[PDB]
Design a protein around this ligand. Sequence first.
Ligand code: NAG
Ligand code: NAG
Lengths: 48, 50
Amino acid sequence: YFKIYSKHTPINLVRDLPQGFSALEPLVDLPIGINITRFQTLLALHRS
Amino acid sequence: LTGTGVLTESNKKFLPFQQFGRDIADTTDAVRDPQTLEILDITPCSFGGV
Ligand SMILES: *[C@@H]1O[C@H](CO)[C@@H](O)[C@H](O)[C@H]1NC(C)=O
Ligand SMILES: *[C@@H]1O[C@H](CO)[C@@H](O)[C@H](O)[C@H]1NC(C)=O
């Protein structure tokens, strides 16, 4: 099971992670049962 | 979740994922019911020595 936990906290600190506490509630559990050893982030492009 | 006890209304702020919150002795203390998604207390039926 691939579980996802999440939290969205309003911050304004410029660069690093904030100094404080914030708990991440579970969001959805995925009954997938696959072999995972790698992951990759997805981004977007900008053409003007 | 078989068990015997008196059900009441609960003010325990069960977050959406939380359903069947326990106590120290790992026995259920407050359960969120099926078919209604409403939160109830479980305090045991009154007992004591004689
Ligand atoms: C997942 O793949 C790796 C090879 O990259 C292998 O060594 C491992 O046994 C696999 N695990 C499962 C659960 O299939
Ligand atoms: C049936 O159960 C669902 C929760 O799975 C609930 O949202 C719904 O209100 C229930 N309907 C009736 C008629 O009890």
